[PDB]
DNA sequence: CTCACGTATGCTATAATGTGCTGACGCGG
DNA sequence: TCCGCGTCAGACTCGTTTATAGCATACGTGAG
RNA sequence: GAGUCUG
């Protein structure tokens, strides 16, 4: 069961791991967030819904006044994306929200009986999502990166050393709240435990718990366990718990009743420990001498005098507990605290602790946070309560509190947002738990501890930064204003709210340039994700743990795609499986394993469930329905891996390749290739410019569909049915009746984008797939996008290469490459550049657009036309005139040079100077397109009105072909129904079908039917005048530019350049190349077949390099194309149906255990030459990454095609005609031409402008720079002897502005001299040096 | 200066100035009308801090951070940092007669010599170019020849083949470890648009071609000409300068 | 470690003493009548006032100290200006002082290029209808829209909302480097003027003793002061007929020796 | 690393060879990125020196 | 020689009188 | 606790928010 | 300055 699109071109598989999960929508990410941030819930807090709740509702200082929030809406976008991309605009909708004032009497006491004032206020415009999943901010697109931040809840740390050579491990917790102060505790050298609010000045961690009203006695029952002394007779006595002493050495002799357990002076092993518990010890006689350092519990009292005999946590001694008995106490309440378990660490901090009572603690917490400012006793309770204890200024938010209360081994997930007295202690006692050695460490690059931010969460946090801004506005004007004439929009603005998205939208780190030079590039771009910008890392920051890969990257993140820059470990790309769970965590799929037998039961599990269960590995192999084959099964569990039994297995890997992402999952072989060539492979793949012919691979994953398809770069059928008219601009579908509604007419028209300027400048062209009258389904692609073959991803084109030195042309990665390559325009590449020429406002007078224009030859006024526009159509090079543009001059005092020169010619020329947009330097292209934007006042150029007169026309057309065809298929259908019950075939064909609307039948169902399609009918007459009279309004709109500009002339290039030396090629397993020379045919090495090698590579790029799969490819793709010249050779004799048919299914079904069966005979014998006539040109075949294609399959392959078994061929020198004295290896990699040209790249200056302050010539090719001759390189001359040349590159070269224009003028009249001078930049740096009051003189001879 | 885009752009330093000059001006101000002492305090602390901020922000504490949030430069920071003036404008500049592209084999040369495309020479030559155009009498002045230069008339190449003859020219390649980062060559006029390097040099350059770029530097008096020739030249640079094996050695 | 020019300040002004209504009334006709103590006593007293009227003016122009401070020079003409005979607060009278100063200094000291108060207060009413207009129109003000809202010039409301546009550090998001030096022209450029300099002594040595005696004597290129067909007539010419017969005469001549030379056409484009 | 890689190129890393290889290769690209520059640190050192 | 034009300093009276980001690099002297 | 350091060039793109009474006399230079 | 890159 096979598809259409998939009947005209089957992938060979040689997968054998059948696929329980299909790969899914890769842009989910950007899709769910977003739209959970626009998305109207009225219970689940998701985006604005919860920003509204937060904030609002806003009640006055006064609190008479309150506003509050009803619900909002979003009007529909102003402009499309198309026109928003052509004026240069943000694709918005305005945020329109209801809102009510509502007002309290002062003299009543909360009367809410005065004045309701509701209406609906604009708030900004926010930013829409595409259904692609970019953002279209000033017309230019772009993508917001999901973030990878530390979650909210508790983490408890420890510097490893660091700190004190003494190197003491010194451990911490902070908590992290969503929102509010962060609150640290931490020890300290000493053993002392403090608190650190908001990384402030340290205070003994005690404090906190006096502002919290606890008293000394309450801590230390809080934190330790009390021991009983009680006081009998004479001898002191107490209560034993038999383990406690354990691993202890015991200090005094330890008796029993009246018999002895302990030798004083030994330790206590585990058998004394048995024999007092068994024994049931509950006295010990004890000597009075070991009480002494003991700590008191409680406040003990004289019940004589009332008087305190010791203050609790008291050190004890011999004649505090003489003076305890004789008051009448014969029970004492100490501290359990025998170091190594049980620490005496709140002991301690409570001596340190100078605060007393609750109001000294929150003094001093409040005297810290505000040093200086007097406290009172409001003020330090406020202050307290507003840090951790305000719904308003703190929030842990779900996701906090969660991991907060599993961080604690809670039972229950959800609670509140602010911390309760309970969260602080468990915190602390954890803390202390892990510094007595019970507990560990949490890590803080596990992914259980990194949380995923996509767009929803950050769009919804800036648009909580804008009402908070609004909130102080409003409660302020709330309070001073009269409160009934004043209605709630005098007091809103919008401009902060539309500042802070905007800011976000448009200035944030994470919203960058889509990265659009082909479909992978942009599908992996979404799918990215930072620790950078906004609360994140920094580069600075970023250390060498966080790069590193971590165990539970797999299945999440990929371990083989992050940029080899500073940015190395920063970002990274998502696995191909992974999602995020409601958290905000990464979570992977897995197959349960149920009593051995594998489900197809799927489980996603987050970071921290994974580390619980052993999971199988995905090539384990499973037995036919059932169970493992092999006992001992290969799995992994807590983040490492060893072998297992079958009972002892609960999951295992859904697919080989949830490991890995999107980018790598499209390298063939990668399971032979070095994972750092590989990385290289995935990242240059993205630098793929795609081609003028779309090449499809011959040597595929299966990833290729996958990423065509959902990249939406492709043209994908929703409806199906049978296509009514295909154009090289349209394509028409007649929806089949079971999927087609009944109610609005049942034609779908997809229009496709022709040749249109990407961001990296590349052309995005899309063409139609399907012929006239094709019958397709659901999900089949109607239109290829610009790298894409019939449905598959076609990043470049694959060659005929051979492994092989030639002299010297490819010596290090450099590349020789045939002529053949060129001549077919393989790897010729289409570039629409777009240029703007704008016509500004000055204080002398406005620019004029005109084609007069002063000292200009007639060659380039011919090709501008009566306003000063170059015509569509025409070819252009360096300096020739696209928008001729004036400016005025003020007054132009000359030269008397230019007075005699201005006279010869009597060119005076007005008052107007030159300031044409002309075509760059060395840049040539046909000019494809011309836009004019004018500002609504003034006067409209004769071009700019015909533009408009072409846009109205075509829109008349583009609308009337829509009511046409929408009321043809519309009337077709109702003749069908018209003669369900009623037979009037030639008669109702024959009266006009204008006049149709007095036409029924009897009253049934089938009358309702002529009723829809009636009202439908009258519905799309009107809609089609409503439409035409929006088009007509935007065609005529004045557009508002920015202030100063009166027009803007935006023309658009088409350039087509060629391969060429210097070009950047690269396969897809890290390969690179420079082209080095293009040898003609003859040159070229050639087969016994006579036919010419396309590419030469050199041997030696290989085994250095460990990307074997490159050679794999090779064999294989030679394989590939030998079945397709088998394929070729049957088509070109025509041959039999029959023939084929056997050949092609012996061919499909090869593969040793080849999981895809292909039953060929199904096919119609038509469906089966569209199919040869597409494997002519090469057999495609489908690596999947980790279960491949076998070096022995691949040579059955080759014996299909009758290709040596070696892959390598005997070869002829084209040159010599003479045969190469060893086999080459021969056969078709995949290569592509990346985005680095060397047209872009070859820059060269003698003289050009200078510097502003420094003087030096500028940087950068843009700008016609100057290379900088940096210290390294000054270094290089100093080695040498070089003086002269330095001293040029230092003076004549650089600043010296004298001696630049006298070396110049000597240069010219052949001095080769230098007069060297005075560097401008020293000049400087001496006035920057007194301007810092420092007397710098040059002393003279 | 002002933009293009008729909006103006300043220095940071025109905002401390301005700092400066209005708390020192207002000081002036509440002298003259006899103020009480806390608020002439407040004034003189301000101005301590103003003249702070403008010859060193950020080391009084807290730097005054302007229009972003990104700290203002101040006086001190143009100098200081190696982004100051020293490492960047005076230690290293850049250059005139400079230029860069891709690198790319050139097997057929010999040891001493590289491809240069025309295109770039003829821009790096221009005034060599004007002054052998003077003196055949084919360019009557400077305007002329540049004007025959950007026709790219036929003569003109002649020419330019002409002035390269004998002329060395330096190339660079960053990372410049050691002094074989640059090397002298004696050019090859080519067609097409990238640098040709010979093999055996590929070594000092460390240069590999998979889209490595190479500065191009041409020395101007016959002074640099012959500094270039004699002590620069790649023949004349065979051993490594840290240890006495040949760098020039086949792979 | 109380360090900060802010915190010092306000813990000064915590530690005076706030005055009462017959206390301001005793200590005002004092202050008036030209007493030391009571104005000091008035001013100190009432700085409090000033920074309630500061701290919601800050993040708009100047800082905090900056607002305290010129706010505070409102204090000083309030008290000044007082009048203890009217019945009514000191506090109502001294608000006015305090906002007007702060106001009037953050229009002029924030913006580098200085803008006028008449431009500002323009200024004031466009954005203010603009707002108005926002609320409504679900989109952003035009310039035309709000120029049609206040019945005024669309040129004269583009002028002011160009101003508006705030001047970003040059050095800050470097911008200096990418821009270049317009007023230094190139080696190329002055080099181009020191052979056509150069060509005119030649060229002045080669046509008639009288074509080039009132030819540069007219342009300033001998002589010192360029003057016109008419001024020419200073020196020993005296004529204005004859002057623009033999200036052209002088011209078409030279305009033979570019032809032949061979420039003309050739420095026709240049 | 405990657990060594017990397979070669030519007979292709499997998930979990891969996934392990992969620590050592980025650690690599890492190291030339960051440790660039304290060697480049002590070039200038010695030059300035001598 | 006189007025308009551009720019600036002036005064207004219910009472109101105390502030307020981002955190985490690592080695040496 | 503070302050000082942390390779060398190259390519491109983006980007420059905020609210601030109205009106009368006074001070000063330019244009007709 | 914040980017994504090429050595
Ligand atoms: N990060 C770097 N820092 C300094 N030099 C480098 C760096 N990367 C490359 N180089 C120099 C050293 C060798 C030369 C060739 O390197 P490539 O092929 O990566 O370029
Ligand atoms: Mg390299
Ligand atoms: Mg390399």
Redesign the pocket.
């Known amino acids: 069961v096979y598809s259409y699109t998939e009947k005209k071109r089957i992938r060979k598989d040689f997968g054998k791991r059948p696929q329980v999960l299909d790969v899914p929508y890769l842009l989910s990410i950007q899709l769910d967030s977003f739209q959970k941030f626009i998305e109207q819930d009225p219970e689940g807090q998701y985006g604005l819904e919860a920003a509204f709740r937060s904030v609002f509702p806003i009640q006055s200082y006064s609190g008479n006044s309150e506003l509050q929030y009803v619900s909002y809406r979003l009007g529909e976008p102003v402009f499309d994306v198309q026109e928003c991309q052509i004026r240069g605009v943000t694709y918005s909708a305005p945020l329109r929200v209801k809102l009510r004032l509502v007002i309290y009497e002062r003299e009543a006491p909360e009367g809410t009986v005065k004045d309701i004032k509701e209406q609906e206020v604009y708030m900004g415009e926010i930013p829409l999502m595409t259904d692609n999943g970019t953002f279209v ?2 017309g ?1 697109e772009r993508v917001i990166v999901s973030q990878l ?2 979650s909210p809840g508790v983490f408890f740390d420890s510097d490893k050393g ?1 700190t004190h050579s003494s190197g003491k491990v010194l451990y911490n917790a902070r908590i992290i709240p969503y929102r509010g ?2 609150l640290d505790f931490e020890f300290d050298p000493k053993d002392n435990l403090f608190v650190r609010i ?2 402030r000045r340290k205070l003994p961690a005690t404090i906190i718990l006096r502002a919290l009203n606890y008293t000394t006695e309450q801590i230390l029952d809080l934190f330790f366990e009390k021991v009983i002394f009680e006081i009998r007779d004479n001898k002191l006595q107490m209560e034993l718990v038999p383990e406690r002493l354990r691993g202890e050495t015991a200090s005094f002799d330890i008796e029993a009743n009246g018999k002895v357990y302990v030798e004083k002076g030994r330790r206590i092993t585990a058998r004394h420990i048995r024999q007092l518990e068994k024994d049931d010890v509950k006295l010990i006689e004890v000597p009075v001498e070991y009480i002494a350092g003991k700590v008191v519990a409680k406040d003990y009292i004289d019940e004589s005098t009332g008087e305190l005999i010791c203050a609790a946590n008291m050190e004890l001694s011999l004649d505090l507990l003489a003076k305890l008995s004789q008051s009448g106490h014969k029970r004492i309440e100490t501290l359990f605290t025998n170091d190594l378990d049980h620490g005496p660490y709140i002991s301690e901090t409570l001596r340190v602790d100078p605060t007393n009572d609750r109001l000294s603690a929150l003094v001093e917490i409040y005297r810290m946070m ?1 040093p ?3 406290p009172t006793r409001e003020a330090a309770e406020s202050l307290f309560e507003n840090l951790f204890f305000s719904e308003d200024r703190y929030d842990l938010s779900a996701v906090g509190r969660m991991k907060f209360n599993r961080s604690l081994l809670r039972e229950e997930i959800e609670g509140s947002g602010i911390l309760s007295k309970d969260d602080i202690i468990d915190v602390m006692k954890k803390l202390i738990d892990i510094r007595n050695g019970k507990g560990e460490v949490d890590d ?1 690059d596990h992914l259980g501890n990194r949380r995923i931010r996509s767009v929803g969460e950050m769009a919804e946090n800036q648009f909580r930064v804008g009402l908070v801004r609004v909130e102080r506005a409003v409660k302020e004007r709330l309070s001073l204003g009269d409160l009934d004439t004043l209605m709630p929009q005098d007091m809103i ?1 919008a ?2 709210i ?2 802070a998205v ?2 976000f939208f ?2 944030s ?1 994470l919203s ?2 889509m ?1 659009q030079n082909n479909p992978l590039s942009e599908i992996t771009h979404k799918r990215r994700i ?1 620790a ?2 906004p609360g994140g890392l ?4 970023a ?1 060498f743990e966080v790069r590193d890969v971590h165990p539970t990257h797999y299945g999440r993140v990929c371990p083989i795609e992050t ?3 500073p ?1 190395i470990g920063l ?1 990274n790309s998502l696995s191909v499986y992974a999602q995020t769970n409601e958290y905000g965590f990464l979570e992977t799929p897995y197959r349960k394993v149920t009593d051995g037998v594998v489900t197809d039961e799927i489980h996603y599990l987050s970071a921290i469930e994974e580390g619980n269960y052993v999971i199988a590995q995905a090539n384990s192999n499973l037995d036919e329905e059932g169970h493992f084959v092999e006992d001992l099964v290969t799995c992994r569990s807590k983040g490492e891996s060893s072998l297992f039994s079958r009972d002892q297995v609960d999951y295992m890997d859904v697919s080989t390749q949830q490991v890995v992402s999107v980018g790598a999952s499209l390298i063939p072989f990668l399971e032979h290739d070095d994972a750092n060539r590989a990385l ?1 492979g995935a ?2 793949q993205r ?1 793929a410019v795609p081609t003028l012919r779309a090449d499809k691979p011959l040597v595929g994953t299966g990833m290729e569909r996958a990423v065509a398809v959902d990249s939406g770069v492709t043209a994908v059928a929703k409806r199906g049915g049978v296509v009514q008219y295909v154009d090289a601009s349209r394509i028409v579908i007649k929806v089949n009746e079971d999927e087609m509604y009944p109610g609005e007419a049942g034609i779908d028209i997809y229009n496709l984008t022709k040749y249109t300027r990407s961001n990296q400048n590349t052309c995005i062209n899309q063409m139609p797939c399907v012929s006239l009258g094709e019958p397709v389904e659901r999900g089949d692609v109607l239109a290829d996008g610009p790298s894409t073959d019939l449905g598959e991803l076609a990043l470049g084109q694959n060659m005929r290469v051979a492994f092989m030195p030639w002299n010297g042309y490819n010596f290090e990665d450099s590349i020789l490459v045939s002529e053949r390559v060129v001549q077919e325009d393989r790897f010729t590449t289409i570039h629409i550049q777009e240029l703007a020429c704008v016509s500004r406002d000055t204080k002398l007078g406005p620019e004029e657009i005109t084609a007069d224009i002063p000292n200009v030859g007639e060659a380039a006024l011919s090709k501008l036309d009566e306003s000063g526009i170059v015509y569509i159509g025409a070819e252009v090079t360096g300096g020739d005139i696209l928008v001729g543009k004036v400016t005025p001059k003020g007054e132009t005092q000359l030269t008397p040079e230019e007075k005699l020169l201005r006279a010869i010619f009597g060119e005076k020329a007005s008052d107007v100077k030159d300031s044409s947009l002309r075509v760059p330097n060395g840049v040539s292209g046909t000019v494809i397109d011309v836009q004019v934007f004018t500002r609504d006042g003034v006067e409209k150029d004769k071009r700019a009105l015909e533009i408009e007169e072409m846009q109205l026309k075509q829109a008349k057309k583009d609308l009337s072909e829509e009511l046409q065809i929408l009321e043809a298929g519309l009337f077709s259908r109702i003749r069908a129904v018209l003669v369900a019950g009623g037979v009037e075939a030639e008669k109702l064909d024959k009266l006009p079908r204008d006049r149709w609307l007095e036409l029924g039948l009897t009253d049934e169902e089938k009358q309702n039917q002529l009723e829809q399609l009636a009202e439908q009918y009258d519905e799309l007459k009107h809609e089609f005048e409503k439409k035409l009279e929006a088009k007509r309004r935007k065609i005529t709109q004045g557009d508002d530019l920015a202030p100063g500009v009166l027009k803007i002339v935006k023309v658009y290039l088409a350039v087509k350049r060629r391969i060429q030396p210097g070009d950047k090629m690269a396969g897809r397993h890290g390969n ?1 190349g420079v082209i080095s020379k293009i040898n003609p045919i003859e040159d070229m090495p050639y087969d016994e077949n006579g036919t010419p090698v396309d590419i030469v590579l050199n041997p030696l790029g290989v085994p250095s390099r460990m990307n074997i799969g490159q050679i794999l490819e090779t064999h294989l793709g030679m394989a590939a194309k030998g079945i397709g010249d088998k394929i070729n050779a049957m088509l070109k004799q025509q041959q039999e149906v029959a023939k084929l048919r056997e050949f092609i299914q012996r061919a499909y079904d090869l593969g040793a255990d080849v999981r895809q069966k292909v039953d060929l005979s199904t096919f119609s014998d038509e469906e089966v030459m569209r199919l040869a006539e597409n494997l002519r040109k090469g057999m495609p075949i489908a690596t999947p990454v980790f279960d491949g294609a076998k070096e022995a399959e691949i040579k059955e392959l080759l014996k299909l095609g009758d290709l040596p078994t070696s892959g390598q061929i005997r070869l002829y020198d084209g040159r010599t005609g003479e045969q190469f004295e060893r086999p080459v290896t021969v056969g078709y990699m995949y290569m592509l031409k990346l985005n ?1 040209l060397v047209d ?2 070859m ?1 060269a200056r003698s003289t050009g402008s200078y510097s502003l302050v420094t003087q030096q010539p500028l ?4 700008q016609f ?4 001759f ?4 000054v270094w290089a001359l100093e080695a040498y002897g070089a003086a002269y040349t330095l001293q040029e590159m230092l003076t004549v070269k650089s600043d010296d502005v004298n001696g630049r224009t006298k070396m110049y003028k000597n240069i010219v009249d052949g001095n080769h001299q230098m007069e060297p001078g005075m560097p401008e930049s020293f000049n400087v740096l001496l006035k920057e040096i007194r301007s810092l009051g420092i007397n710098i003189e040059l002393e003279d001879e | 200066v002002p933009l293009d ?1 008729g909006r103006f ?1 300043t220095s940071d330093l025109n905002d401390l100035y301005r700092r400066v000059i209005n708390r020192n001006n207002r000081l002036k101000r509440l002298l003259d009308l006899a103020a009480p002492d806390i608020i002439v305090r407040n004034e003189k602390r301000m101005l301590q801090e103003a003249v702070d901020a403008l010859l060193d922000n950020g ?1 009084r504490g807290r730097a005054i951070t302007g ?4 700290p203002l430069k101040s006086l001190a920071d143009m100098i ?1 940092g ?1 982004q100051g003036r020293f ?1 960047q404008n005076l230690l ?1 500049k ?1 250059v005139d007669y400079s230029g ?1 592209s891709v690198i790319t084999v050139g097997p057929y040369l010999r040891l001493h010599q590289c491809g240069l495309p025309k295109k770039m020479a003829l821009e790096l030559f221009k005034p060599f170019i004007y002054g052998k155009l003077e003196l055949r009498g084919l360019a009557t002045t400077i305007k002329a020849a540049k004007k025959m230069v950007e026709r790219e008339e036929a003569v003109v190449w002649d020419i330019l083949d002409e002035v390269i003859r004998e002329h060395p020219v330096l190339l660079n ?4 470890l050691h002094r074989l980062g640059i090397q002298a060559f004696e050019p090859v006029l080519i067609e097409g648009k990238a640098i040709q390097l010979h093999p055996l040099v590929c070594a000092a350059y460390n240069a ?1 071609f ?4 190479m500065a191009v530097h041409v020395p101007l008096t016959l002074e640099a000409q012959l500094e270039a020739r004699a002590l620069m030249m790649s023949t004349n640079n065979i051993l490594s300068p840290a240890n006495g094996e040949p760098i020039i050695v086949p792979s | 470690r109380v360090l900060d020019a ?2 010092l300040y ?2 000064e ?3 005076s003493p ?2 009462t209504a017959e206390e ?1 009334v005793y200590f005002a006709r004092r202050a008036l009548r030209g007493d030391v103590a009571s104005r000091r006593r008035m001013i100190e ?5 000033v ?2 009227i500061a ?1 919601r003016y ?4 100047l800082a ?1 100290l900056d607002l305290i401070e010129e706010g505070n020079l409102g204090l000083i ?1 309030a008290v000044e ?3 203890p005979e ?12 305090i ?2 100063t702060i ?2 200094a ?2 002029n000291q ?1 913006r580098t290029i ?1 803008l ?6 323009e ?3 466009y ?2 209808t603009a ?1 108005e207009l926002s609320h409504k129109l679900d989109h952003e003000p035009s310039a035309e829209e709000i120029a049609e809202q206040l019945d005024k010039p669309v040129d004269d409301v583009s002028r002011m909302l160009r101003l ?3 001047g ?1 550090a040059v050095d ?4 200096l480097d990418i821009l270049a030096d317009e007023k230094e022209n190139g080696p190329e450029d002055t080099t181009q003027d020191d052979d056509m300099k150069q060509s005119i002594v030649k060229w002045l040595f080669e046509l008639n003793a009288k074509q080039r005696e009132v030819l540069a004597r007219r342009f300033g290129l001998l002589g010192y002061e360029a003057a016109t067909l008419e001024d020419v007539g200073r020196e020993i010419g005296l004529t204005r007929e004859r002057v623009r017969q033999i200036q052209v005469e002088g011209l078409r001549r030279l305009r033979e020796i570019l032809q032949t030379q061979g420039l003309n056409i050739e420095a026709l484009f240049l | 690393i405990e657990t060594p890689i017990t397979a070669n190129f030519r007979e292709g890393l499997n998930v979990l060879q891969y996934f392990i290889s992969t620590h050592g290769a980025r650690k690599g690209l890492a190291d030339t ?2 440790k ?6 002590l070039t ?1 050192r010695l030059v300035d020196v001598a």
Do not use: C
Request: no cysteine; charged share 35%.
């Open positions: 901010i000033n230019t931040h530390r660091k102060s962060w908001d990384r505000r200086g400012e007097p803080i603005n401009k902060p539309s500042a905007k800011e448009g200035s780190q960058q340039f990265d930072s950078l910008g920094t580069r600075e920051r250390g940029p080899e820059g940015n970002i290289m990242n240059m630098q690179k680095h872009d790249k820059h940087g950068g090719k843009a720079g100057g290379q900088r940096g210290e390294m390189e | 885009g752009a080391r229009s972003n949030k990104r200081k190696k490492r290293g850049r860069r390649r960053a990372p410049t590999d998979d889209g490595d770029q | 802010t915190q306000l813990g002004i915590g530690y706030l005055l301001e007293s009432n700085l409090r006032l920074v309630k701290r800050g993040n708009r122009g905090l003409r200006k007082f009048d009217r019945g009514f607060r000191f506090s109502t009278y001294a608000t006015w002082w906002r007007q106001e009037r953050i229009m924030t200085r006028p108060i008449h431009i500002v207060k200024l004031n009413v954005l203010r707002r508006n546009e705030r970003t800050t998001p470097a911008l | 990125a960051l660039t520059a304290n060697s480049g640190y200038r």
